[PDB]
Amino acid sequence: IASGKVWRDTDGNVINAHGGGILFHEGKYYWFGEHRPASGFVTEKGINCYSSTDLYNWKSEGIALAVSEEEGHDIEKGCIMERPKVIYNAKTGKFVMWLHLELKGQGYGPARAAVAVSDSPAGPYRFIRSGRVNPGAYPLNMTRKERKMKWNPEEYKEWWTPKWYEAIAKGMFVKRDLKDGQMSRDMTLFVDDDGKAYHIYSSEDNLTLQIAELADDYLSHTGKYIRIFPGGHNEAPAIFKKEGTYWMITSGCTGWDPNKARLLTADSMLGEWKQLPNPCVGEDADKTFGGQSTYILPLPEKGQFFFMADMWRPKSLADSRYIWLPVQFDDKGVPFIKWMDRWNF
């Protein structure tokens, strides 16, 4: 595992799986990610999939979720498809893919999460629906008093004033988006011990993280959700659970530029969360080693976890590389990550 180098599949082609994540099923790891083009930023293809027995040799499984050729479809060619994650639904036996969708020709405005389904890990997946999250429902931890407040859009046009920040903290953008549902851009998924799944996403114009419970088949949301770190600008969330504790690594919001990772922790997924120091340590840790969090893969057979990131090259996004590093734990059980040029499982 040689972070930042050109990685190739078994045919010799550059692995094209960005913003991704990995699952294990029937003896194989399946890596899902954005198919990025050589020029431009929008996918020409959809969500790509690769498979491996060993986490070193990756076989191209082809496109798992394709862009549609039908005009007016939510996922017609030219839509934005980012940060795909796949989870297995044990009750129905289906593979469920969620992803950040922006409708074609609308930039990043729609701020939707989309959901697709497959009988097999590699696909093809069948698109079901897209939309903002939980129309009509308030966050669980947004208080009665906060829900009763009125925010005149004309008084709060200037971002980053003291009164605007306070307003964002007390849920001004939640109320703004209440009817049509909460915004979802950068996102991930987590399947808990009891089969409860959660959709974690940057919401409220990227200012605030939200964690939403998924329904029992993982195809919709239940209405139950919380919001955390309002105004915190936590992006590209990555999550894992260890010995009952939930840990989340995120980035800041500086477009393509690498920035300082944050470490967030809770004892309950929908309980209170708190922020801990940058979990990256050593030289370049202030820049997350030139990367941005995408996924934390548990290896539950070994009681270990590994941190996946993207080393984004905005000049040509197909040339973006992959940083994969062991998650280590200090004497208090707090995760940290150090660079290694080459390491083995």
Ligand X SMILES: OC[C@H]1NC[C@H](O)[C@@H](O)[C@H]1O
Work out whether 210 is an interface residue with Ca ion (CB under 5 A). Answer: no
Choice between 41 and 343, CB closer to ligand X: 41
CB of 96 to ligand X, least distance (A): 20
What residues have CB less than 8 Å from 316, skipping those under 6 apart?
A: 38, 39
CB of 19 to Ca ion, least distance (A): 16
Work out whether 48 is an interface residue with Ca ion (CB under 5 A). Answer: no
Residue 234 interacts with, from ligand X, Ca ion, none (CB under 5-8 Å by kind): Ca ion
Residues 216-255 vs Ca ion: string with x where CB under 5 A? ------------------x---------------------
Distance between CA atoms of residues 345 and 343, nearest Å = 7
Asked if residues 198 and 268 have their Cβ atoms less than 8 Å apart, the reply is no
CB of 252 to ligand X, least distance (A): 10
Cis peptide before 139 (omega within 30 of 0): no
CB of 297 to Ca ion, least distance (A): 23
Distance between CA atoms of residues 5 and 319, nearest Å = 10
Q: Which of 17, 64, 111, 209 binds Ca ion (CB under 5 A)?
A: 209
For 315-339, give the DSSP string: TSGGG-EEEEEEEEE-TTS-EEE--
Q: Please, which residues bridge with residue 89 across strands?
A: 94
Q: Segment near Ca ion (CB under 5 A), from 1-9, 45-53, 208-216, 290-298? A: 208-216
**Which residues bind to ligand X, rule: CB under 6 A?**
19, 82-83, 186, 235-236, 255
Nearest to 151 by CA among 132, 124, 176, 131: 176
Residues 152-191 vs Ca ion: string with x where CB under 5 A? ----------------------------------------
Q: How far is CA 242 from CA 188, 334, 336, in A?
A: 17, 10, 13
Nearest to 132 by CA among 54, 216, 199: 199
Work out whether 202 is an interface residue with Ca ion (CB under 5 A). Answer: yes
**SS3 category, 310:** strand
Q: Which residues are part of a known binding site for beta-D-galactose?
A: 82-83, 108, 113, 129, 131, 134, 186, 292
Choice between 51 and 250, CB closer to Ca ion: 250
Residue 294 interacts with, from ligand X, Ca ion, none (CB under 5-8 Å by kind): none
Distance between CA atoms of residues 297 and 326, nearest Å = 10
Residue 139 interacts with, from ligand X, Ca ion, none (CB under 5-8 Å by kind): none
CB of 185 to Ca ion, least distance (A): 9
Residue 209 interacts with, from Ca ion, ligand X, none (CB under 5-8 Å by kind): Ca ion
Distance between CA atoms of residues 335 and 242, nearest Å = 10
Cα of first residue to Cα of last residue in the chain, in angstroms, is 9
Q: Which residues bind Ca ion (CB under 5 A)?
A: 202, 209, 234
